[PDB]
Amino acid sequence: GPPGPPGLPGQRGERGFPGPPGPPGPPG
Amino acid sequence: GPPGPPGLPGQRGERGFPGPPGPPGPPG
């Protein structure tokens, strides 16, 4: 017989990590 | 002959990009 159909698409990746902190606030 | 079986699932996607930087902190 002919080759079978293509495989399923890969699972989507995991969500990225949370971003880094913002800089210090401005001086008082 | 009938078609062969489906192919293997694709490779899992890579992790998403890290999140954006947080905001600036509060004024001192």
Add this chain to the structure above:
Amino acid sequence: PPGPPGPPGLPGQRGERGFPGPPGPPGPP
């Protein structure tokens, strides 16, 4: 008989962007 297996599937999409980071620390006095 049945044929050979099909080709592997396409790679997955890259994951979603991470959540925004937290505030920075308070500024100095």
